[PDB]
Design a binder for this molecule. Structure first.
Ligand SMILES: Nc1ncnc2c1ncn2[C@@H]1O[C@H](COP(=O)(O)OP(=O)(O)OP(=O)(O)O)[C@@H](O)[C@H]1O
Ligand SMILES: Nc1ncnc2c1ncn2[C@@H]1O[C@H](COP(=O)(O)OP(=O)(O)OP(=O)(O)O)[C@@H](O)[C@H]1O
Ligand SMILES: Nc1ncnc2c1ncn2[C@@H]1O[C@H](COP(=O)(O)OP(=O)(O)O)[C@@H](O)[C@H]1O
Ligand SMILES: [Mg+2]
Ligand SMILES: [Mg+2]
Lengths: 464, 47, 505, 240, 49, 120, 49
């Protein structure tokens, strides 16, 4: 029945149980702290079977003042997370308790965080083409349905605003809800994010889960699993496609290596856990789409010391489809998406899938931009006057296309006042086909900033 | 006029040596770090 | 027979333990039936100890102070509970033991209330946004990376750059705010010194009392002559006193001299305690350790009094390396950086702050309106100026705009220099940056701009005082003030001559 | 009479920085890095840079114009150098005015742990009682760090990453503090530090620098050029 | 190993069997993990000899 | 052994050829790992010099018996710092070397002239 | 050591002696092998301290 603690070494806790009450791997244990000034309860998880009715466990919360011989009880079940329709109205961590108030309780249903990937037989044999409202991403870096895509950038490059735009666009166009999971996220940044989401009136249909650094690595390694568990619950219960957000993967790998080296195992491969691919596969195998419902995920990975051959980035890159890059020179140019078309690519771009004309237009655009970039040196050193007619006309077409490639978004009305618009792929490809000839070289520079379709832009230009 | 192009091409060719040598130095330092940690752990566990 | 075991366990004048072995700053004690983690143990000779590792038949210990008195056969006594620090308000203008004792020659201090070091940090639902002008006294600092209340800022630098001077000047810059009556501008600054020579501590303190800021500061110093325990535990004491003063609604500012020494002490004690090692012979939990000391600082909500704190950790690196373990961890754990390259200090700029790498996360939210307007985005101007010197170092013929931009960039760079022990108020800095941006000094010879501006500000402080009153009462620059300043600078530059100069319209 | 080797560090309450312009006759030290009386100045460099010649010239130039007592201690050095130094000091009359102690390399590392402590004990006995200016000169400090590393390895203690013994910085701080000039007494300490393979990433030179304020180091490239002083001006610095 | 065995059984019959080994390094990593979990001393680059 | 039997009894000059001696050394390392002996640098045998020396000195030309040998040795991972060829260097008189770059040039007898050496 | 002693015997007699060592790394290698055989703890790349 009850159990007694034997030895205590930091967060590692050893427990001893009677003969007929040995628990199974990955169970929950509850304990209390007697001291008044540090009154608290501790939860522990089973990870090893040392034998002789001895179990080694990891504390989920910081330990202090623990006393030997204190009785411990067993939950009889693994980590439980609450699911229901009342979710996505508030914020809460991996433990499940809401931070704003403890009002939410056990009324909702409870599920185990541990699951298994779906079978091989019922896997979707064919991929789908996921369309968005932004022309640049559809034309240059097509999005695969149910895949994984990486985003690179920093602060001041308009990535948070783009995330909000994507959240509201997926909420409004195709319905469904998106959950946010922050692992290793600073508390001040989390509070600012909560305030921004609340002020945008889109916090209603989003479930926010946070991971604090002050917690031991157990939260840092289980928050992602909890987020995926609730996302799968929503997908399989409501039939609505969900969008999953992960801030970083590097901290997850660091937490894995930490919990590995704390158990007294053997390090290998530049101070890394020997089976990191096992954890990576177990995490990534439950993101594929099935049964006609899609689960798209967004990640932002960090490269250490500008190295690409490091084992952790190498393992991460094994499950990637598209990459997006942002810079500041494009920001200095003054366009909205702030993405470099030359530094990003997609693995689904094939002439037999997206049409031959799309591939031809993309190749023409890339060639024009590359020639413009190559001739920037001569433009800086001598100018356009010395350049011949062909060079000057291609430069004009390139700069006009660059100005045209920007598209007005919706939440940009917070500083401009004009909601954005969505355009079909056919209109965009036909517009780029007609622009391939550069017939609009006589247009003034200001008229080339897009707001929507092409007829409205032509009318506005004629209204200048 | 012929003189200018020589220096331009010299700069153009000089960039790649920098790139390659930086890559080689990165690989060498990574190898030394991993081998030293491996050997110290191997010395530690055996006793 | 189980009842016998139960009765024997439940049976348990003062509890006494026994030392079994000792050596190299740690000892082993057994016989204690029930103890709490991090108990403050007591030893018969008067030395203190803490419990870190617990075993089925042993208790690990670490001796803080004197160690040679330890021997087999001594009797330990379980005392009190988790160790706490007696905090109060009489700590101002004194130097104390990290344990909380008056090492300085001044008499014993009073006690107000005991606070335990291990406490929970404020949650997310008890914080506001950051908007407040914390000054720095240095032109480039607040000109490129603004600093606000509740914001953690990192300073990392190489060997022999001058970070200590910057920290001291920032500490002493608040004399005028202290002179103000209400405590809204009053900030209680504290200093933490870890592993520094006693002569250096004495010289720093002497500089403090020469500046005249001894009234509102205290020092927590742990010289190298101490054992590992004090080096490991001093930052927690500093954080405890800082958070206690914050809890009453008073603005305070914590400064850490170094963190590498604390990490070294932690590694030493962990390895001596026979614990599994990892990468770079470092314990696993070291990263978590930092998260427990740097995440305390945060802006408070008005419901709890609206307290504020600000921390300035300092990190040193060797041979200009950034990819090391601890620097990478600390960089990833905080926001905002200030790189200090040795080459820039080698010649030319004395502050030697890098421009192309420095960044601040908060940015404009911590910027006063007037100098934000006057800033004019000179970051990009300096960037293109550097990219253009990288090209035109040997140029004789150029574009006229290119030559003008190069000259403006050179003038602004020569203006940005500032000597040490020279704090400045906001108004003169705003005037100087307005002078720099407008190009009024473009005709001033490049070798003698700095000194020149000197006289102007002195003359500006001499024959006129309305502009300062306006800029202090409205925090904004008006058109009439700009016209008066233009007239004043024109009439001053009309009658100035450094070396074969010329006055031009 | 006999005194215990182990002692206690002086109180912090009796500490005051010392500022003074002491001048020698050599141009580089006069202009680049002026020395300070009562402080610490250390030498740096790899193998065979010529620092021993520099210290010999320094002691020859200074001891003549000095009325105080000097104590010289050699932690590790060849017998030939010590014998030659003894002969040279015997060649002049200043030998009577000084005290000598040293230990060789052939001895076991245990004897290389206490020679510095004995020198410090003699220095403090002279300074605290006689109240006279004294000179304490140290040939090197790397050797005892080495011998500590090996003795700790033999003791069965787990080594650190680089292989150095743990808590080496604790021993560093314990040793360095003993050299301190109070408000009434002044003492000058000369030391030269050997770096392994002229690598400055080694934590040992980095942690030994922290106890220094005015420093002068040496380089091998300028020596290979042909210059004998071989002092690098870009990296050398002072505090006065 | 199972693939090799099923190939050899038809080899006995004296016919032509083509075999594909789309991944090798993964098996090496699996064996490395198995060896390290068996506390056997790792060789070069954590790979046993 | 059989070569020595031919050399001694018959009193005849003997030609000898051996191939890929390096594998031999490798084998020893493996069995050492199973015996439980303390590992050495780069995970080799605690003792390797003595076996190489005794195997090399076993081949020796007597006054009345001339024996000519030629051994091919492998190099792992295109690195020359490893102890396996480092120890073998001390037991050789006529040595020729190959390189990857010279082979990539195109000439098939990829023999480095600057690195090859001889004692005759 | 044997060579050194042989030299020292004539050294004490007043005769000038010259000594040449062919190699020194071999001695270090042999000592390292002996120490590793005798179950002594290793050191920096497996050399005794
Ligand atoms: N603005 C300045 N102009 C000229 N010299 C300066 C200036 N600021 C600092 N210095 C000089 O630079 C040195 C800085 O010494 P300081 O002790 O602050 O160094 P540090 O880089 O912070 O490192 P450490 O703590 O290791 O000594 C001193 O010699 C000081 O006189
Ligand atoms: N001014 C000088 N003129 C000529 N030779 C000089 C001069 N200064 C030094 N040397 C030469 O430098 C060497 C002096 O060696 P010294 O003992 O001073 O070196 P060190 O740097 O202390 O090295 P180590 O500790 O490795 O012996 C001799 O070869 C000496 O001839
Ligand atoms: N295309 C754009 N046009 C105008 N302003 C922009 C654009 N992109 C970003 N910004 C501005 O940059 C600021 C930073 O945005 P963002 O990079 O999303 O957040 P963070 O800097 O925290 O990562 C925002 O306040 C936004 O107003
Ligand atoms: Mg300093
Ligand atoms: Mg010398």
């Amino acid at each position: 029945t009850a159990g007694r603690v034997v030895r205590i070494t930091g967060p590692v806790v050893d427990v001893e149980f009677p003969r007929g009450s040995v628990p199974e791997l990955f169970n929950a244990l509850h304990a209390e702290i007697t001291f008044g000034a540090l009154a608290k309860t501790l939860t522990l998880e089973v990870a090893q079977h040392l034998g002789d009715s001895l179990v080694r466990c990891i504390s989920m919360q910081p330990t202090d003042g623990l006393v030997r011989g204190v009785e411990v009880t067993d939950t009889g079940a693994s980590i439980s997370v609450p699911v229901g329709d009342g979710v996505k109205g508030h914020v809460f961590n991996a433990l499940g308790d809401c931070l704003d108030d403890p009002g939410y309780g056990k009324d909702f249903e409870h599920w185990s965080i541990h699951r298994k990937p779906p079978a091989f037989s019922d896997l979707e044999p064919r991929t789908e083409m996921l369309e968005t409202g932004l022309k640049v991403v559809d034309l240059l870096t097509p999005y695969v349905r149910g895949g994984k895509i990486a985003l690179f950038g920093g602060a001041g490059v308009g990535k948070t605003v783009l995330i909000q735009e994507m959240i509201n666009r997926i909420a409004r166009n195709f319905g469904g809800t998106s959950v946010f999971a922050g692992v290793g996220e600073r508390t001040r940044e989390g509070n600012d994010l909560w305030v921004e989401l609340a002020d945008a009136n889109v916090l209603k249909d989003t479930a926010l889960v946070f991971g604090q650094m002050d917690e031991p690595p157990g939260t840092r390694m289980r928050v992602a699993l909890s987020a995926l568990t609730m996302a799968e619950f929503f997908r399989d219960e409501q039939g609505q496609d969900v969008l999953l957000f992960i801030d970083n993967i590097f901290r997850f790998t660091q937490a894995g290596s930490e919990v590995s080296t704390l158990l007294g195992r053997m390090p290998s491969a530049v101070g890394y856990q020997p089976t990191l691919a096992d954890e990576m596969g177990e995490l990534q195998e439950r993101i594929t789409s099935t049964r006609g419902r899609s689960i798209t995920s967004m990640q932002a990975v960090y490269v250490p010391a500008d190295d690409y051959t490091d084992p952790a980035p190498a393992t991460t890159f094994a499950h990637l489809d598209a990459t997006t890059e942002l810079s500041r020179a494009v920001f200095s140019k003054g366009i909205f998406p702030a993405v470099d078309p030359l530094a990003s690519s997609s693995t689904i771009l094939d002439p037999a899938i997206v049409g031959d004309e799309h591939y031809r237009v993309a190749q023409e655009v890339i060639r024009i931009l590359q020639r413009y970039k190559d001739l920037q040196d001569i433009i800086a050193i001598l100018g356009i006057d010395e350049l011949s007619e062909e060079d000057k006309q291609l430069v004009n077409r390139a700069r006009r296309i660059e100005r045209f490639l920007s598209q007005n978004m919706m939440a940009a009305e917070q500083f401009t006042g004009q909601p954005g618009s969505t355009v079909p792929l056919k209109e965009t490809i036909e517009a780029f086909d007609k622009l391939t000839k550069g017939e609009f070289d006589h247009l003034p520079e200001q008229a080339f900033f897009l707001i929507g379709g092409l007829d409205d832009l032509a009318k506005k230009a004629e209204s200048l | 006029a012929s003189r200018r192009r020589a220096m331009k091409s010299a700069t153009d060719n000089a960039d790649d040596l920098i790139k390659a040598l930086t890559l080689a130095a990165n690989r060498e330092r990574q190898a030394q770090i991993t081998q030293e940690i491996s050997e110290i752990v191997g010395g530690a566990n055996a006793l | 027979i189980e009842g016998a075991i139960e009765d024997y366990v439940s049976s348990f004048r003062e509890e006494i333990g026994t030392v079994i072995d000792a050596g190299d700053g740690i000892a082993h004690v057994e016989g204690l039936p029930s103890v709490m983690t991090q108990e403050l143990l007591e030893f018969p000779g008067g030395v203190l100890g803490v419990a870190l590792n617990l075993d089925e038949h042993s208790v690990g210990a670490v001796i803080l102070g004197e160690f040679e008195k330890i021997e087999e056969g001594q009797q330990v006594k379980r005392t009190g509970e988790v160790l706490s620090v007696p905090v109060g308000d009489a700590f101002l203008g004194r130097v104390v033991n990290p344990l909380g004792q008056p090492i300085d020659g001044q008499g014993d201090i009073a006690a107000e209330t005991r606070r335990a070091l291990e406490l929970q940090a404020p949650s997310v639902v008890q914080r506001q946004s950051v908007s407040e002008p914390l000054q720095t006294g240095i032109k480039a600092i607040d000109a490129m990376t603004p600093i606000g209340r509740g914001q953690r800022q990192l300073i990392i630098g190489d060997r022999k750059t001058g970070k200590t001077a910057v920290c001291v000047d920032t500490i002493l810059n608040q004399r005028e705010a202290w002179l103000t009556g209400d405590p809204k501008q009053q900030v209680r600054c504290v200093y933490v010194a870890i592993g520094q020579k006693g002569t250096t501590i004495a010289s720093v303190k002497r500089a403090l009392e020469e500046g005249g800021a001894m009234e509102y500061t205290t020092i927590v110093a742990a010289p190298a002559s101490d054992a590992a325990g004090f080096k490991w535990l001093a930052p927690y004491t500093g954080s405890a006193i800082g958070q206690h003063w914050m809890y009453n609604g008073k603005h305070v500012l914590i400064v850490f001299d170094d963190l590498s020494k604390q990490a070294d002490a932690y590694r030493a004690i962990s390895l001596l305690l026979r614990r599994p090692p990892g990468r770079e012979a470092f314990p696993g939990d070291v990263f978590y350790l930092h998260s427990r000391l740097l995440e305390r600082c945060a802006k408070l909500s008005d419901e709890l009094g609206g307290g504020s704190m600000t921390g300035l950790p300092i990190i040193e690196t060797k041979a200009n390396d950034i990819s090391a373990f601890i620097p990478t961890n600390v960089i990833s754990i905080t926001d905002g950086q200030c790189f200090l390259e040795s080459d820039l200090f080698n010649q030319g700029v004395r502050p030697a702050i890098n421009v192309g790498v420095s960044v601040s996360r908060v940015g404009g939210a911590a910027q006063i309106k007037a100098m934000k307007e006057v800033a004019g985005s000179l970051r990009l101007d300096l960037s293109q100026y550097r990219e253009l010197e990288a090209f035109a170092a040997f140029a004789s013929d150029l574009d006229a705009a290119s030559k003008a931009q190069l000259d403006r960039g050179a003038r602004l760079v020569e203006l940005l220099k500032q000597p040490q022990y020279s704090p400045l108020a906001v108004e003169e800095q705003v005037v100087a940056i307005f002078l720099g941006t407008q190009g009024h000094l473009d005709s001033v010879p490049v070798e003698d701009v700095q000194r020149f501006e000197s006289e102007l500000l002195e003359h500006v402080k001499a024959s006129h005082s309305d502009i300062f009153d306006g800029i202090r009462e409205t925090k904004k620059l008006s058109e009439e003030a700009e016209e008066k300043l233009v007239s004043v600078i024109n009439e001053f530059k009309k009658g100035f001559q450094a070396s074969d100069g010329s006055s031009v319209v």
